[PDB]
Amino acid sequence: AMYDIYGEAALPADVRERLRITRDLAQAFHERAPEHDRAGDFPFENIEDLKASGYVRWTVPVEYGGLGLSLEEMLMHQEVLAKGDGSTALAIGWHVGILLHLRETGAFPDELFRMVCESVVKEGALINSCATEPATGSPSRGGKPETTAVKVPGGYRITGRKTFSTLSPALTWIMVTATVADEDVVGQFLVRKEDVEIVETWDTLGMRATGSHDIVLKDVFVPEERVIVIQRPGVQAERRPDGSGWLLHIPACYLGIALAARDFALEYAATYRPNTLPHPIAEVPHVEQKLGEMELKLLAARTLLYDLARRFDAASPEERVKLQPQFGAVKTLATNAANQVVDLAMRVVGGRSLSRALPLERYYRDVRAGLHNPPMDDVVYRNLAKAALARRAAG
């Protein structure tokens, strides 16, 4: 799984072939990353490659023409992709991740799930969840959206606005959360991309190519068949809970960006020799220590990541609920650790690291984003604490 350290020999034939694919895609995305980050535009060509490679249906079940891939293997590819370009990796990770979430949970009604899965496999349709609003902050904090959903003859009229709508230029389907006006309950709703207005607001420090714009919905119709859930008193969304394990795509992406940073600084340190030294800066003690620290951080966070993915794939829905606090833990570890690794990479390279002609400054910008995908650090510590308190109590 951590093949770059432990060798590819372990892996089976078909995984090795899949890995050649993602490594090629990553290398292409890398060549194209500078210009897209400079323009802050959306990389339609990267999405076309993902679609033609088949990647976009890798997590769709085998019963609908997908590959049914494990979470562990999906993370591996996401990490490879992010090492090429983080914006693209993170955008597509929402898609493949969400399909795995739906696959493992039965959160979608069977008819709706089958319909969505078809469009992915036969048309390359892409999906994402667009729930963030200014008024609520992170949906993970539990705020009722001001996006309102009003009951009409065929289904619901949705009116509102969502921010950070990743992948939106290339989306077919959008899951949108909204409060049902008259009843005071939250619902989730599957909207077609064609019925919303993208307002091109995304202009950011990093992850500039995710296309995470605003979407505006003005009286948008959702037919009853496309209503995902309405969370009334006494209802489960997920028929088989997954403990949000799919959200592990987040740490995998930000570690991938960190490995790119580490690789650049290692290459740079190995070859840069000022006229003050008889050897390259890789042999200077303080540089060596920073190099070694990067290594430790990556080792720890990645080992934890893949260990937890591997447990997720073997676990029952009850065991997956119990692992949720650890899934948060690895997110907080890996994203903070990713920031620190790029920081150190930059210190190794020095003043030259500020140069836009090298990719290292883009890594520093891109990696920042992981701090603000869910779950949040304070929530992660809290839930870790509460789970520890419950284990004591169970004794």
Ligand X SMILES: Cc1cc2nc3c(=O)[nH]c(=O)nc-3n(C[C@H](O)[C@H](O)[C@H](O)COP(=O)(O)OP(=O)(O)OC[C@H]3O[C@@H](n4cnc5c(N)ncnc54)[C@H](O)[C@@H]3O)c2cc1C
Tell me the two tokens of residue 294: 């990067």
The contact set with ligand X (CB under 6 A) reads 90, 94, 128-132, 137-138, 141, 164, 166, 207, 210, 212, 274, 276-277, 281, 284, 287, 347-348, 350-352, 354, 369, 372-374, 376
d(CA 43, CA 29): 9
What is the DSSP pairing of strand 185-192 with strand 227-230? antiparallel
Binding partner of 243, given ligand X, a second copy, none, CB within 5-8 angstroms per partner class: none
By beta-carbon proximity to a second copy, the closer residue of 11 and 384 is: 384
Has 268 been labeled as part of a binding site? no
CB of 270 to ligand X, least distance (A): 12
What is the DSSP pairing of strand 173-180 with strand 127-130? parallel
| For residue 109, cis peptide bond before it (omega within 30 degrees of 0) | no
Has 351 been labeled as part of a binding site? yes
Tell me the two tokens of residue 84: 């090429």
| Spatial CB neighbours of 32, under 8 Å, sequence gap ≥ 6 | 43, 45, 46, 85
Binding partner of 386, given ligand X, a second copy, none, CB within 5-8 angstroms per partner class: none
| Spatial CB neighbours of 24, under 8 Å, sequence gap ≥ 6 | none
CB of 258 to a second copy, least distance (A): 17
By beta-carbon proximity to ligand X, the closer residue of 18 and 164 is: 164
Has 128 been labeled as part of a binding site? yes
Among the candidate windows 85-93, 132-140, 235-243, 244-252, which touches a second copy by CB under 8 A?
132-140
- Residue 307 class from Cβ within 10 Å (0-12 exposed, 13-18 middle, 19+ buried)? middle
Mark 240-279 with x for binding to a second copy (rule: CB under 8 A) and - for no binding: ----------------------------------xxx---
The answer to whether residue 184 forms part of the interface with a second copy (CB under 8 A) is: no
Q: Tokens 């620290």 belong to which residue?
A: 293
Among the candidate windows 59-67, 76-84, 314-322, 359-367, which touches a second copy by CB under 8 A?
359-367
Please give the single-letter amino acid code of residue 278. Answer: P
Binding partner of 348, given a second copy, ligand X, none, CB within 5-8 angstroms per partner class: ligand X
Conformation bin of residue 167: beta by default, left when phi > 0, alpha when psi is -120 to 50: left
d(CA 159, CA 227): 15
d(CA 130, CA 169): 13
H/E segment holding residue 255: helix 249-271
- Residues at the interface with a second copy (CB under 8 A): 132, 135-138, 141-144, 146, 164, 203-207, 274-276, 286, 346-347, 350-351, 353-357, 361, 364-365, 368-369, 371-372, 378
Q: Which residues are annotated as a binding site?
A: 128-129, 131-132, 138, 141, 166, 272, 286, 347-348, 351, 372
Could you tell me which residues are annotated as the binding site for FAD? 128-129, 131-132, 138, 141, 166, 272, 286, 347-348, 351, 372
